[PDB]
Write a protein that binds this ligand. Structure first.
Ligand code: QUS
Ligand code: QUS
Lengths: 48, 48, 48, 48
């Protein structure tokens, strides 16, 4: 995930409603925070 | 990793409620991202 | 409340002047700070 | 400084007491914060 979060070539999506999306919402790890700032910043929507 | 309470400890219930309150504020996570990463001065990038 | 913690970085570490400081001030680390946020809320005196 | 702060091959020191060292102390920019966490973490002392 450190190699995920440091490169924006790849897009990161999860389910529209589940335990995975909510896990990155209430997370506060810096790697996990920076992903959730990207997951919200989805043009188009990464979620499915 | 969990807090070890002796069998029949008075601090079996309040510690477990303290586990939840630090998690709900993300304070468990905001300790983890702080201590591992300010110490992470040989970030694997440097030898690469 | 006597708190047993094993001596292992980064969870429990030795301060730079570990002979100078004693008790709670001697010990730094993650489980040390984890003990402090619990004992603040659960109100118990902790000795490391 | 972004190319400074992302590589620990080079050491960063300032004066022992002046307007430059204190500027990185009270700074809160993330690039400037990460330098001051390195300036404090000096083995040996970066300052002069
Ligand atoms: N089953 C999971 C939902 N979920 O489905 C996946 O394919 N990943 C994932 O977290 C839940 O209980 O929320
Ligand atoms: N003159 C500066 C001190 N200073 O000397 C340098 O060579 N850089 C620098 O910030 C001050 O007023 O604190």
């Amino acid at each position: 995930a450190e190699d995920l979060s440091k490169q924006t070539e790849i897009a990161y999506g999860t389910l529209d409603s589940g335990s995975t999306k909510e896990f990155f919402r209430r997370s506060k790890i810096a790697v996990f925070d920076k992903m959730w700032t990207y997951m919200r910043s989805a043009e188009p929507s990464v979620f499915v | 990793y969990g807090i070890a309470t002796p069998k029949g400890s008075s601090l079996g219930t309040p510690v477990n409620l303290a586990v939840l309150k630090l998690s709900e504020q993300g304070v468990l996570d905001k300790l983890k991202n702080k201590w591992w990463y300010d110490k992470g001065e040989c970030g694997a990038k440097d030898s690469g | 409340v006597v708190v047993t913690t094993i001596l292992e970085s980064p969870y429990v570490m030795m301060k730079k002047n570990h002979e100078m400081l004693e008790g709670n001030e001697r010990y730094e680390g993650y489980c040390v700070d984890l003990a402090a946020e619990i004992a603040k809320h659960c109100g118990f005196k902790y000795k490391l």
